[PDB]
Amino acid sequence: SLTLILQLVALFAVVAAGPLVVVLLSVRGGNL
Amino acid sequence: GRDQETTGFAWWAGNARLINLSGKLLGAHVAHAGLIVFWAGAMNLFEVSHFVPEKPMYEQGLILLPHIATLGYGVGPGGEVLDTFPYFVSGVLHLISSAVLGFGGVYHSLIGPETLEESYPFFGYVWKDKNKMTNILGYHLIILGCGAWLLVLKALYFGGVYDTWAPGGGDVRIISNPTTNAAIIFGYIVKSPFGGDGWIVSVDNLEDIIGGHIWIGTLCILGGIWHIYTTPWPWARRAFVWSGEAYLSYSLAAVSLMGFTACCFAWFNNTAYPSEFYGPTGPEASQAQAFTFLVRDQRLGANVASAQGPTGLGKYLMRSPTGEIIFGGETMRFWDFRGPWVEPLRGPSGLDLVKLKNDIQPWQERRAAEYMTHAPLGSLNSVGGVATEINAVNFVSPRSWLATSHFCLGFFFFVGHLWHAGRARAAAAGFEKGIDRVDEPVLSMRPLD
Amino acid sequence: MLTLKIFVYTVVTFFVGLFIFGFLSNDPSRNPGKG
Amino acid sequence: PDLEKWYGPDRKLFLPGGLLDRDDVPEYLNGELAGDYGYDPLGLGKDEEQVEKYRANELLHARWAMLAAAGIIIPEGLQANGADIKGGTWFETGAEMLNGGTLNYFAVPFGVVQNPLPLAAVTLIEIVLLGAVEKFRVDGTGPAGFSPGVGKFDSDIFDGLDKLYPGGPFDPLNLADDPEVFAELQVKEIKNGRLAMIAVLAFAIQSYVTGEGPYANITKHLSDPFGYNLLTVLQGDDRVPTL
Amino acid sequence: MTSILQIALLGLVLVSFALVVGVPVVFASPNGWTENKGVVFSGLSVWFLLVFAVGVFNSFA
Amino acid sequence: LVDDRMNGDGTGLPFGVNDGILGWVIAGTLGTIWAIYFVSQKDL
Amino acid sequence: ERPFSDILTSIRYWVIHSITVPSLFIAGWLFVSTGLAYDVFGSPRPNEYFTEDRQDAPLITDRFNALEQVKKLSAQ
Amino acid sequence: IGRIPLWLVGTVVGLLAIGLLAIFFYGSYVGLGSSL
Amino acid sequence: KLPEAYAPFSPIVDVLPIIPVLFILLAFVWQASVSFR
Amino acid sequence: ENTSLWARFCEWITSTENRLYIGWFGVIMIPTLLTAISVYIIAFIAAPPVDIDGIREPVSGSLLYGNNIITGAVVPTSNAIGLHFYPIWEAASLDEWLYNGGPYQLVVCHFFLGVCCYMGREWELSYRLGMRPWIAVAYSAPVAAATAVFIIYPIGQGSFSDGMPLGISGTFNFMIVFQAEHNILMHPFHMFGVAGVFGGSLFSAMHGSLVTSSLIRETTENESANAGYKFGQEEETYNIVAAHGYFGRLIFQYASFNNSRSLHFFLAVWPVVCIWLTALGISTMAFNLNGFNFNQSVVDSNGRVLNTWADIINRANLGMEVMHERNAHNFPLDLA
Numbered sequence A: 001s002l003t004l005i006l007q008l009v010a011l012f013a014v015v016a017a018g019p020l021v022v023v024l025l026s027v028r029g030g031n032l
Numbered sequence B: 001g002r003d004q005e006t007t008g009f010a011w012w013a014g015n016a017r018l019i020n021l022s023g024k025l026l027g028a029h030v031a032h033a034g035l036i037v038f039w040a041g042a043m044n045l046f047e048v049s050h051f052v053p054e055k056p057m058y059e060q061g062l063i064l065l066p067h068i069a070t071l072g073y074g075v076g077p078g079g080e081v082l083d084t085f086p087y088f089v090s091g092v093l094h095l096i097s098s099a100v101l102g103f104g105g106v107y108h109s110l111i112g113p114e115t116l117e118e119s120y121p122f123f124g125y126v127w128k129d130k131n132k133m134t135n136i137l138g139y140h141l142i143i144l145g146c147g148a149w150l151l152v153l154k155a156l157y158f159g160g161v162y163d164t165w166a167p168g169g170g171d172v173r174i175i176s177n178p179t180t181n182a183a184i185i186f187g188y189i190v191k192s193p194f195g196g197d198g199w200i201v202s203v204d205n206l207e208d209i210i211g212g213h214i215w216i217g218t219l220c221i222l223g224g225i226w227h228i229y230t231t232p233w234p235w236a237r238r239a240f241v242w243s244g245e246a247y248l249s250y251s252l253a254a255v256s257l258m259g260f261t262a263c264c265f266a267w268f269n270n271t272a273y274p275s276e277f278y279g280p281t282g283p284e285a286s287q288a289q290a291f292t293f294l295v296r297d298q299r300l301g302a303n304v305a306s307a308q309g310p311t312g313l314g315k316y317l318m319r320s321p322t323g324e325i326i327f328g329g330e331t332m333r334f335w336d337f338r339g340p341w342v343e344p345l346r347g348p349s350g351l352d353l354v355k356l357k358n359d360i361q362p363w364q365e366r367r368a369a370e371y372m373t374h375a376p377l378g379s380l381n382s383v384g385g386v387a388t389e390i391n392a393v394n395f396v397s398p399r400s401w402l403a404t405s406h407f408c409l410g411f412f413f414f415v416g417h418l419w420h421a422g423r424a425r426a427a428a429a430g431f432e433k434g435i436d437r438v439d440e441p442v443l444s445m446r447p448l449d
Numbered sequence C: 001m002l003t004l005k006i007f008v009y010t011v012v013t014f015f016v017g018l019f020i021f022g023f024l025s026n027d028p029s030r031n032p033g034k035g
Numbered sequence D: 001p002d003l004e005k006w007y008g009p010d011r012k013l014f015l016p017g018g019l020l021d022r023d024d025v026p027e028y029l030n031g032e033l034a035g036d037y038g039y040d041p042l043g044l045g046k047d048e049e050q051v052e053k054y055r056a057n058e059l060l061h062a063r064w065a066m067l068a069a070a071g072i073i074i075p076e077g078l079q080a081n082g083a084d085i086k087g088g089t090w091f092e093t094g095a096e097m098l099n100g101g102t103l104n105y106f107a108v109p110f111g112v113v114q115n116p117l118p119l120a121a122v123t124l125i126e127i128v129l130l131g132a133v134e135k136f137r138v139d140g141t142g143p144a145g146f147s148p149g150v151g152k153f154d155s156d157i158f159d160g161l162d163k164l165y166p167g168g169p170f171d172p173l174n175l176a177d178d179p180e181v182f183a184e185l186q187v188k189e190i191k192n193g194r195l196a197m198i199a200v201l202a203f204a205i206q207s208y209v210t211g212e213g214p215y216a217n218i219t220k221h222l223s224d225p226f227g228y229n230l231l232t233v234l235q236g237d238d239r240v241p242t243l
Numbered sequence E: 001m002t003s004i005l006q007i008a009l010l011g012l013v014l015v016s017f018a019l020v021v022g023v024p025v026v027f028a029s030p031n032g033w034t035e036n037k038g039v040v041f042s043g044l045s046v047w048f049l050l051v052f053a054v055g056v057f058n059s060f061a
Numbered sequence F: 001l002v003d004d005r006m007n008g009d010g011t012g013l014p015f016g017v018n019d020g021i022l023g024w025v026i027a028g029t030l031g032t033i034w035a036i037y038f039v040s041q042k043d044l
Numbered sequence G: 001e002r003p004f005s006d007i008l009t010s011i012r013y014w015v016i017h018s019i020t021v022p023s024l025f026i027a028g029w030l031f032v033s034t035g036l037a038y039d040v041f042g043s044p045r046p047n048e049y050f051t052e053d054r055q056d057a058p059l060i061t062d063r064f065n066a067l068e069q070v071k072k073l074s075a076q
Numbered sequence H: 001i002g003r004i005p006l007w008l009v010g011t012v013v014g015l016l017a018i019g020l021l022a023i024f025f026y027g028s029y030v031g032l033g034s035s036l
Numbered sequence I: 001k002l003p004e005a006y007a008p009f010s011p012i013v014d015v016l017p018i019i020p021v022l023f024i025l026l027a028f029v030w031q032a033s034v035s036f037r
Numbered sequence J: 001e002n003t004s005l006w007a008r009f010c011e012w013i014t015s016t017e018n019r020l021y022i023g024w025f026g027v028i029m030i031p032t033l034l035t036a037i038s039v040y041i042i043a044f045i046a047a048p049p050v051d052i053d054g055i056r057e058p059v060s061g062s063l064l065y066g067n068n069i070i071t072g073a074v075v076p077t078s079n080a081i082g083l084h085f086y087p088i089w090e091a092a093s094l095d096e097w098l099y100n101g102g103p104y105q106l107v108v109c110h111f112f113l114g115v116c117c118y119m120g121r122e123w124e125l126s127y128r129l130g131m132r133p134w135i136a137v138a139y140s141a142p143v144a145a146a147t148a149v150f151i152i153y154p155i156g157q158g159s160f161s162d163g164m165p166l167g168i169s170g171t172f173n174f175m176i177v178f179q180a181e182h183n184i185l186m187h188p189f190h191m192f193g194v195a196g197v198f199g200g201s202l203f204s205a206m207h208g209s210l211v212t213s214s215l216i217r218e219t220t221e222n223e224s225a226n227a228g229y230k231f232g233q234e235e236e237t238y239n240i241v242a243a244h245g246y247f248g249r250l251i252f253q254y255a256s257f258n259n260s261r262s263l264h265f266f267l268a269v270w271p272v273v274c275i276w277l278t279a280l281g282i283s284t285m286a287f288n289l290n291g292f293n294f295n296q297s298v299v300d301s302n303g304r305v306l307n308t309w310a311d312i313i314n315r316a317n318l319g320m321e322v323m324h325e326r327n328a329h330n331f332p333l334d335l336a
């Protein structure tokens, strides 16, 4: 369903956000 | 960030690394406040998105919408919801404010100054600076007094709050003439916490609640000014320990007491926690079952005054140990329950016989049947009823959820208070890292323990 | 019963006052630590 | 007087230390004038002299708006609380003298007096008085004397009097002979004037949007904050509940 | 007006996600804060503008 | 009634003080301990 | 040997296991979805707990002919 | 050899474990054994 | 239910309350990335 | 020469040379615990029967009324009293106080105060000896459990008659009725508590067996191996390296506790946190949150209920429920 698909998209986005920030700070310089 | 070698703290105690970093500690605090406001807004938006208008709030697993409804937004007579847009606005305002608080917290955690003492002496502090500690405490006391006065202003001039004791089954009411009498206000704080007394949980009218909030706001503002303009006295300086961990332990004890008290408010109080929004209390549900089985057998022609059970006490009516006419059965233990649907039926001697014979209102009957069927009993997978009931209904009372969660939180914060008070004493005394192995005190003591 | 209540109130008040003023009596100084 | 919060390099700025390092502040703003927060995002100053004449304009607007904010808010509040003032709402005081109408001047606390001067006489008096006063300001010369404190002064005390801050006749209460408190009061004056300019702009926009004066706005908003605000007056009618 | 509000709220969600992923990255990047001042200020300003715009358009939608 | 009892239960009684002599003995005991501690301070 | 963190941080390990592990997961999924789990382990499908003959739970009462008893009380 | 970070590996593994546990808890309310 | 103009954002509303749970796990991720320094 | 009366009293109270430490927590602990001990012993020996259910149907409890050590108990307070705080001076007579369950509230209140001050006294002596202070934190778990069964559960249920009876068979009655009404076995917090006591037994046996296994030879076979240890010896009495090597070869060379301090922290933290969890489970079921209700969870395609082990447990709980307080219920729902 469209509701379940949008919920899954939002869930994947929020779950991947923080790890992406950490990965980007690891590969882009540091200070983490 | 910092490592263990330069701080002496492992990663699982890494927040201790910023005990003496004022700017980073401030950043952690502001980010955390953003987290709290984020949960408030997100949970409020979740509850309004899942809110269904025809069912009552307590049947829908909601804990914040009852709070805003008790404040008196979007509800009418009988606790009926008229509009959920105020709830949506509350959620949106919290969720937006959480972004600003999160930005401030992330800024002060990452790129803000580590210590505020050099460039920002107004905000800079050391934990042993008792004058600055009392200044910060005074600022926060002033803010808390202003919050209590905000509640007072909402109750008096900005639409009032929901009175469950209003005639006809409760309504949103303007509180005129709050109880400002000091004897009445501080009697609550000096009451016993046991049955029939209930300490401050037994506050039963909005006049008493708002008068107590006037007192709390004025006292908080006056004490805030007092702490801004005073320094702790020598007896206090000898009695206390002056360090960040010690202050944290004091706050942990205070909020543990507050969590236990909030547990008891959620479980027992039906005035500040109206049953229209939170469901019946446990005593309310038991008394409602007794009242419903009284009125049913009265409609079946049985005399509910001369009917005695197997023990001989009385199936429907009996006496409290002080002589009041009360409902029979095990709900005798809840004989001190007071609710808006039963207090019209009570005369000076208790449950009035002629009132129970002739003066029963249909709204009282409906609330009693509803509260009997929605007792605060359920499983943690949300199967309503006693442990032996099958998986038919999906219900756990918000009062049950709040009471269980907040007893757990109060207990853990008591334990954390013990941990931090002990560690603060040991660190001030200088043996929080262990026995010196060269100046061991017990080896200098007389034997035989 | 009132005599018993008066006596028990006196006893409890005495022990609680001892507790309170004992921890008020410079208790953080009562340790073998250095500093 | 801690003058270093307003003058010099370590003065207060329009953005804090983490948001604005003291290298983006324009070079023509180096803490030499009152109210210097280093605020010039669009390069409108470009040099000290242009900044100085813009400060002339800014200070004149500041003083006019400081008078205007009180003149807008006070008669409306007096009329609403029960004074015999007509046209208390600032945008409808002009029409009150249209069809030969007159005004009432409430000399506080002494009482309302009927003003006999008609619109033509009022505007002629205003034109001649304001023209003479502005001409005196730009020329640095004035005809007569008798200001308090300085006393009866000849028509030559204006030489050497700094523009935008002429002492002597315009300073009956002294209060500025000490240079430190004079600079500090300059900072106070420019900050109050900027606040009053923003307040007058707010008065205009609020009056246009809501059809009522700022006193009515503040009183009704304090009566009901969540039921009377900008979004509530933009909504128009009562919203359909989302129940 | 409802579609305008929905577009503005979608843009606000996108800008919020960009700020969430980028502001910590810019802050903890080596000399990233002193170089991305304009981008971060533009993001914060457009975020505040979108919040105010959605609040205004709610009274018309 | 067939027997006497204090009947102090419930009623929201301050510190459970149904007779002012109870408040007086509480105040007296606390003040006596405080006075001993006070005239005995600056002695450590 | 190799200290197992070197193993867990090696592209050779991950290019082997991005094939092996999902194949086993899909094998388990197919084992349940194709009914082979029911066939192998004798658990009744949700529609064949009761037959037309018996509408209650089965009861193995014979021991030395329990094989044919469970064959005739099972889902055929 | 260390070409992929161990913390990244552990984070992905924990994400899959949390996802599988969330699937298991979701299956408590749907399908077989869901009281429905 | 949400207001009708905000109804299409109900799917992203339904995910938000778990983000505070995600923050402490993100702290553990960051500590793992600095190798629990 | 520090002649002051309060100073002398304080130096005696905080003295570490007393055989048993008193302290300021002890000046509350000792009288409350002595009161509770005295009343408990006297009541357990010779108390008259107590109408626990408030239905004028008393329960004997004491040895002189025909109980043995197993069946003897101090019976909880009458259900008619509920939570209403019944002390001796609130009774018309000692006979009425005994009939209504006053000794139970007296003992429970004094015991709660005594164990809280016992925890505080543990902290106080650790402070006076220069020790680290968290033995009190460890002792907070049995304190939490006792508070849950004696105070918190009566608070959540509305009556001290729902407190655990001060006895052995009374404890069993409390457990059985608790399972009947709350399904505590299906509660995850109780599962954590069971894991904690079982793991505490496992880890106590494991640690003791490892230390005894790696004991260094200091004695002979005709002498007890304990004689190889002297009180106050500086050197270690066993081989930590050998014990850790055996443990690693036994299960996994990793997932071990070669740090002795980490090992003892684990031994401290596991049963304490699990007893915290199960005490919180009792405290939550006080407010009727209950264990997992899986009754009739499994249905077939046609909707017929397929009974499970949870359903068998439910049958047992039904038998438990329909028999407890056989004369106390007038209405079908057990809401009170």
Ligand code: CLA
Pocket: B011, B012, B013, B014, B015, B016, B248, B252, B408, B409, B412, B413, B414, B415, B416, B417, B419, B423
């Ligand atoms: C107001 C709250 C408060 C504050 C501000 C702190 C602050 C401090 N504590 Mg803590 N603490 C508190 C409450 C508080 N605590 C409570 C409630 C307890 C538990 C009983 C303790 C127990 C305690 C211990 C045992 C220790 C600290 C220590 C510390 C320091 C380092 C913390 C750190 O890095 O943790 C980093 C964070 C973690 C490692 C995460 C832990 C994982 C938790 C358990 C997850 C729980 C989630 C769970 C689902 C929540 C619900 C459970 C239940 C309610 C249902 C720091 C100064 C340390 C210290 O003394 O340093 C000087 C130390 O060792 N504290």
Ligand code: CLA
Pocket: A018, A021, A022, A025, A031, A032, B001, B002, B003, B010, B011, B012, B013, B014, B015, B016, B017, B018, B021, B024, B025, B027, B028, B029, B031, B032, B035, B099, B102, B103, B106, B108, B109, B110, E019, E020, E021, E023, E024, E028, I023, I024, I027, I028, I030, I031
């Ligand atoms: C409530 C959660 C909370 C808060 C607010 C903090 C706050 C803080 N911790 Mg932490 N921490 C936490 C819990 C928390 N922690 C727990 C659960 C643990 C156990 C793992 C620890 C253990 C710990 C250690 C071991 C240490 C700290 C330290 C720090 C401080 C320095 C931050 C830093 O350099 O990280 C750098 C991190 C990054 C660069 C990556 C994360 C980037 C940001 C923060 C992610 C946020 C995303 C967010 C959605 C963006 C919002 C944008 C906004 C516009 C809306 C910081 C003030 C350090 C310290 O004391 O400093 C001296 C330190 O050594 N923490």
Ligand code: CLA
Pocket: B026, B030, B100, B101, B103, B104, B105, B107, B112, B113, B116, B120, B123, D016, D017, D018, D019, D020
């Ligand atoms: C507990 C709150 C707290 C505290 C005590 C501080 C303290 C400080 N901040 Mg700030 N900060 C916070 C919150 C806080 N911050 C938040 C939430 C934000 C996001 C907007 C920031 C973002 C921020 C920046 C980006 C900068 C500072 C910096 C500073 C320093 C001086 C400049 C200043 O006052 O900030 C200025 C902040 C403002 C002007 C915001 C408006 C504040 C007004 C006065 C509102 C007052 C509160 C009011 C009662 C409403 C309460 C809201 C509440 C109910 C949620 C000082 C150390 C500066 C620094 O460290 O320089 C190196 C710096 O550059 N802050």
Ligand SMILES: CCCCCCCCCCCCCCCCCC(=O)OC[C@H](CO)OC(=O)CCCCCCCCCCCCCCCCC
Pocket: B235, C024, F015, F023, F024, F026, F027, F028, F030, F031, F032, F034, F035, F038
């Ligand atoms: C039921 C009735 C009892 C009511 C209970 C509540 C009563 C109000 C108690 C509030 C006390 C406020 C805290 C003050 C500082 C406490 C620590 C201290 O003391 O620190 C000590 C500090 C050191 O100088 O002293 C000082 O700063 C001066 C502190 C003043 C001490 C107050 C004493 C008031 C009078 C006491 C009774 C009269 C006693 C006489 C009895 C003699 C025999 C009959």
Ligand SMILES: CC1=C(/C=C/C(C)=C/C=C/C(C)=C/C=C/C=C(C)/C=C/C=C(C)/C=C/C2=C(C)CCCC2(C)C)C(C)(C)CCC1
Pocket: B027, B028, B031, B032, B034, B035, B038, B092, B095, B096, B098, B099, B101, B102, B103, B105, B106, B109, E009, E012, E013, E016, E020, I006, I009, I012, I013, I023, I024, I026, I027, I030
């Ligand atoms: C320091 C640190 C930390 C912490 C951090 C934090 C805590 C952060 C945060 C933060 C925050 C706290 C944030 C918040 C936010 C918010 C946001 C970002 C928002 C928004 C918005 C929007 C966009 C919305 C929209 C909407 C609406 C309006 C309504 C309807 C629906 C919707 C949803 C659509 C850690 C631990 C990690 C590590 C260490 C360091």
Ligand SMILES: CC1=C(/C=C/C(C)=C/C=C/C(C)=C/C=C/C=C(C)/C=C/C=C(C)/C=C/C2=C(C)CCCC2(C)C)C(C)(C)CCC1
Pocket: B184, B185, B186, B188, B189, B200, B203, B208, B209, B210, B211, B212, B213, B215, B216, B239, B240, C019, C020, C021, C023, C024
């Ligand atoms: C709002 C409200 C109200 C009001 C309330 C109030 C008014 C409250 C208060 C209160 C108060 C007013 C309180 C107080 C308190 C106190 C406390 C809580 C304490 C304490 C402390 C401590 C714990 C101490 C300790 C110590 C000692 C003992 C000695 C040594 C040292 C030290 C200091 C450590 C009412 C109910 C009406 C209604 C409803 C709502």
Ligand SMILES: [Cl-]
Pocket: J173, J177, J323, J324, J325
């Ligand atoms: Cl039983």
Ligand SMILES: [Cl-]
Pocket: B328, B329, B330, B331, J328, J329, J330, J331, J336
């Ligand atoms: Cl019953």
Ligand code: NA
Pocket: J324, J325, J326, J327, J328, J329
């Ligand atoms: Na029964």
